[PDB]
Amino acid sequence: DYLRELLKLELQAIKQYREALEYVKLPVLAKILEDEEKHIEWLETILG
Amino acid sequence: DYLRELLKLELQAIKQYREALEYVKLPVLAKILEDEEKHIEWLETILG
Numbered sequence: 699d700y701l702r703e704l705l706k707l708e709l710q711a712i713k714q715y716r717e718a719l720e721y722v723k724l725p726v727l728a729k730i731l732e733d734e735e736k737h738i739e740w741l742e743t744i745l746g
Numbered sequence: 747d748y749l750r751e752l753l754k755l756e757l758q759a760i761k762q763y764r765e766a767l768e769y770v771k772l773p774v775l776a777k778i779l780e781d782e783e784k785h786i787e788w789l790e791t792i793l794g
């Protein structure tokens with residue numbers, strides 16, 4: 699569950715860095731974004 | 747605004763990752779703190 703909630707905060711993180719990338723195209727949001735996709739997989743493996 | 751939002755997210759995040767890293771010491775989670783630690787760095791720069 700805590701793992702699950704970080705699984706969703708990370709999820710949320712994705713959708714927002716997504717939109718914001720969409721509107722300001724700062725390369726840097728780009729890189730963090732990819733780090734949150736990672737956090738996801740790390741989470742998923744740990745998770746269900 | 748979206749910048750402050752992102753800021754808040756990661757501050758949210760950094761906070762739970764810590765408790766989680768607290769309750770059970772899985773190096774993955776700290777590996778994720780350092781990431782969220784870079785992002786906040788970066789968010790701060792964009793925020794100047």
Ligand SMILES: [Co+2]
Nearest residue numbers: 708733734737
């Ligand atoms: Co993350």
Ligand SMILES: [Co+2]
Nearest residue numbers: 730756782785
């Ligand atoms: Co982050």
